[PDB]
Each structure stands twice: as structure tokens, then as C-alpha cells.
Write a protein that binds this ligand. Sequence first.
Ligand SMILES: O=P(O)(O)O[C@H]1[C@H](OP(=O)(O)O)[C@@H](OP(=O)(O)O)[C@H](OP(=O)(O)O)[C@@H](OP(=O)(O)O)[C@@H]1OP(=O)(O)O
Ligand SMILES: Nc1ncnc2c1ncn2[C@@H]1O[C@H](COP(=O)(O)OP(=O)(O)O)[C@@H](O)[C@H]1O
Ligand SMILES: [Mg+2]
Ligand SMILES: [Zn+2]
Length: 390
Amino acid sequence: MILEEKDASDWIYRGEGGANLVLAYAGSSPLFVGKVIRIQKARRSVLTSDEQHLWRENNELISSPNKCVLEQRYVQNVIIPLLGPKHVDAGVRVSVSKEFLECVDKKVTKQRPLWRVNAANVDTSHDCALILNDHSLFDCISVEIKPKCGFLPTSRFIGKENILKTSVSRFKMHQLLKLEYIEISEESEYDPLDLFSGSKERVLEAIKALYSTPQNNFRVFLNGSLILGGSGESTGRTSPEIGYAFEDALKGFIQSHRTECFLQLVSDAVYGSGVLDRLLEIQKLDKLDIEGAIHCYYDIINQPCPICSLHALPLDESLKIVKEYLIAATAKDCSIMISFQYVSLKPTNQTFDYKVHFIDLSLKPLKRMESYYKLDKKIISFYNRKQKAE
Ligand SMILES: O=P(O)(O)O[C@H]1[C@H](OP(=O)(O)O)[C@@H](OP(=O)(O)O)[C@H](OP(=O)(O)O)[C@@H](OP(=O)(O)O)[C@@H]1OP(=O)(O)O
Ligand SMILES: Nc1ncnc2c1ncn2[C@@H]1O[C@H](COP(=O)(O)OP(=O)(O)O)[C@@H](O)[C@H]1O
Ligand SMILES: [Mg+2]
Ligand SMILES: [Zn+2]
């Protein structure tokens, strides 16, 4: 089953992260109706020598022919054993022509954030792509959430100066630095600690915060069509205008105050799904925080630790720690998609069926332990610094 230059006409922009573009099928084929295609971007072979060393315990993973089988097996072999297979769909292998990739790249350039184009195009060196269900299909209202990390570190390896790292969420400390680099306009109201808190009340607080300031953490589609949140990027606060048209968009679906109810019914969904519980235990596979795990990284890549207990560990442990760090990084950066067509909305007294799905599940590259460390370092220095302003 191979896609050619012709079929580039049957797929249309759904959005992108840093690593991937996502098209939704607008054609007529019964093999792609209700599918998306996830295409890897190339910034400006499957696994490095170091990574092969680190994923050694993984027969199939290490042997994948391309990246797409690589993603396919990562999700299926390493992630599904953890999150569980009602909410994760690893999604199928699909061959594509290099000419199919090119025209797609050209075709949707116009629909992308410019800074996203400055950074990467699609990788036209690929012969392949992954096809996943379109979770915005089930009148389907579909909500995407990018919860980020919903706990605080407690690590012995977090030094005296950085101990704020143990009091203040990474999300909130990062909001300040994103501002500094004009990547967001205002600070986000959302707080993942409320979402992963597990309190029914606080989970709603977070859904509210997400509506006000969605940034790249909140999206809502109807019929697979964006009606709140940025496209391939973050987005500024929800103004009364923005809200007005949203309320109007909820016309019909909800019977009502249509916005107040949407939130309530998204919140009831999330909390009664309990799906944030598992994810949180996976995020917690970061047992030592980057400031601990970074030392394990250097032994693993056979390199004198520039940062210098941890180094006297058996290699089997050092490897585990790194593996676990990166599976964690996968859970910290993934998204939940909730579909609506159970939740019973009190006022109107309606009833909604729902499905929840994890998406944006991606293998983190091992070499990224270094950027992780540098980003983290920069985060806490800028926070500590803007805290001296007192
Ligand atoms: O480009 P952004 O919208 O700012 O998002 C990126 C995220 O992108 P995705 O939504 O595409 O997953 C990065 O992942 P990559 O696609 O670049 O690989 C991720 O990087 P890591 O998962 O490796 O951490 C990073 O997360 P973070 O900032 O927590 O390191 C996160 O940025 P934000 O979530 O902060 O916006
Ligand atoms: N299976 C899916 N169904 C519906 N929409 C999706 C699906 N996968 C991704 N999307 C949309 O496309 C966007 C980008 O996809 P994603 O896989 O998160 O890219 P990246 O890995 O680079 O972050 C997401 O924000 C999401 O809104
Ligand atoms: Mg990704
Ligand atoms: Zn060290």
C-alpha cells in the first residue's frame, strides 16, 4: 500500500508539534476515512550507537527499519504496557513516495506558523508515515489537552541554590522564561498540579485556566475543525470576542451558558476517566530529576562527566534510569484527546458519550539529555534571578 504524488491532494493540515505534521483525510477512500497521517519533520540510522546501547534490552525497538516502525514499536512495546490499550492506538505503517512528501510540504506551508517553517519542513528522505485514527471523529466536539508535568521533584541531587525547583512547578517556572523570549504574550493561568491533583474541584479549576489562556495546552475542535486554540502553535488569551464566537459555536451541541457547561463537562470527563492517574505514574519515572539523571547519561555515552554516588552504580541501573527518564519525558509532553457525542450534564440534563486518547506520543532522542540539562539549568537561574526582584 503506497501513497503517491496524486494523494497529496486528499490530505489537509490539522497541525504540528515540533517533530510532526498531521494531515486529516478529506478524500473518499474507506482505508483513510477518519484517519490522520503523522509525518515526521526534519529540522535544519534509526538509532545512534549510543541509543542502541541504551535500548539494548529491546530486541524489536532496536531493529526497526525506519523511524515510523520505530515510533510504532516504541508506543506498542514500551508505552502500551504502561498506559493500557484502550487509550493508546500505536497506529499503522504506510509507505509514501518521496514525491508525495514533497507536494504535501509545499501544499500546506501556507497554513503553518512562520516560525515553525523557519525551523523545519517535512522529511522528504522518508519512504513512510504513520496513520492514526482521527480522535476528533467519534456532531463531535473534541478536546485536546497538553497537561505537561503534574508533580514536583524531591531529588537529593537538586542543589541548595535550585531548591525552588522543589516548590514551584516546572510549568510555572517556564512560563516566565517563555515570556522573556516572546513565545507567549501573557503568563498561563493553567496549573498542572491542579489537574493531576486528583481533586474533583481542582481539576475543573484547571479546565477553566486552560480556556482563559490555552497557549499550546488547550484545543477544541468541532467536526475535526479548530474552534479554540492555536494552529500548530500556542495562542494568546481568550478574549471576549474569541469567547463570543466559541459560545456561538457550542450552539446546538450543548443545550443552554453553553461555555460554562462545556467546561464542566470536559472536567467531569477528565476526572471520571481517571486517565491522569496512570500518566502521572509514568511522568514519575523521572525519579531523580534531570540534575540526577544527567550523570547516568555520561557513563552511558562513555564520557567523563562534565558536571562533576551515581557513578558507582551498576551499568544495568544507570541504563534503567536513563530509559526511565525518557519514557517519562514522553509522558510529560504528550496530549490527551477527549471525544464527545458517559457524562450527564445537570442543568439542561443531557448525556454525552466519550472516548479518551493519548496522542503526541514520541520517542525522545537520547542525545537530548544534554539540552534537557541546559534548559533546566536556564529555567531555574531565570526564576531564582527574577525572585531577587523583591
Ligand atoms: O514546540 P512546542 O509547541 O513549544 O512544544 C514542545 C514540544 O513539542 P510537541 O508538542 O511537538 O511535542 C517539544 O517536543 P518536540 O516535538 O520538539 O520533540 C517538547 O520537548 P520535550 O518533550 O523533549 O521536552 C517541549 O517540551 P518542554 O518545553 O517541556 O521541554 C515542548 O515545549 P512546551 O511544552 O514548553 O511548549
Ligand atoms: N490521532 C489524532 N487525531 C486527531 N488529531 C490529532 C491526532 N494526532 C495529532 N492530532 C492533532 O495534530 C497536532 C500535532 O500532532 P502531534 O503528533 O502532537 O505533533 P508533534 O509530535 O510534533 O507534537 C496535535 O496538536 C493534535 O491537535
Ligand atoms: Mg512529539
Ligand atoms: Zn557526574
